Amino acid sequence: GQNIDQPTEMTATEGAIVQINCTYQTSGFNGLFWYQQHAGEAPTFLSYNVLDGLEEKGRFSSFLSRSKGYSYLLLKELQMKDSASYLCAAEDSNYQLIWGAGTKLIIKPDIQNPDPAVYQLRDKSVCLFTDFDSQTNVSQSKDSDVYITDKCVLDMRSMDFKSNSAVAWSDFACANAFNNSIIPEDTFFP
């Protein structure tokens, strides 16, 4: 067959539901597969559909519509561990697999008590923007000699506490570090 399409990226919130769509256009059809691939890891089998219907496997469900040439992978009660790329593959008339470019799924943690702040850490120093809610987006550095990383989620499992953070490093000051990003008005600058 000719082509297979799925969204490039999807973002949903922890505890919620997400549907990853996949449309295929093939000459002949012998099945549609879904694989999960965690960053830096190998793809692993999730599901297979050949006839119309929904197949449920725990919090995950796979739907196929033959007439529409459409499938979806449904993820319920979203967890942080669900952050991965989801690969859609269709088996054509000659039993060949046509792979989709994948969909990166990003899970936003549910931040119950946000306490946004920018702290300075010594070993030459590093600036840490932490404890902000999931709505906040961190923008890349405006200057070549200043480095800003993307949002990272850590889980302090024993305290059932999750927190977002971005790191900035390189005159440079923590007060100017994240000036290119729209940060909360209540951000604590010690």
Residues that bind another protein (CB under 8 A): 4, 28-31, 33, 35, 39-45, 48, 50-51, 87, 89, 91, 93-102, 115, 117, 119-126, 128, 130-131, 144, 147, 149-150, 152-159, 161, 163, 165, 167, 169, 188, 190
CB of 81 to another protein, least distance (A): 12
CB of 50 to another protein, least distance (A): 5
Beta bridge partners of 84: 105
Residue 153 exposed, middle or buried by CB count within 10 Å (0-12, 13-18, 19+)? middle
CB of 135 to another protein, least distance (A): 19
Within the chain, residue ranges assigned H as helices are 174-177
Residue 160 exposed, middle or buried by CB count within 10 Å (0-12, 13-18, 19+)? exposed
Which residue type does 28 have? G
CB of 77 to another protein, least distance (A): 21
CB of 34 to another protein, least distance (A): 11
- Between 17 and 93, CB nearer to another protein: 93
**Backbone phi and psi for residue 64, each to the nearest 5 degrees, phi listed first:** -135, 135
- Between 17 and 111, CB nearer to another protein: 111
- Between 31 and 176, CB nearer to another protein: 31
- Between 5 and 17, CB nearer to another protein: 5
User: Is residue 160 left, alpha or beta, with left meaning phi > 0 and alpha meaning psi from -120 to 50?
Assistant: left
- Cβ(48)–Cβ(32) below 8 Å: yes
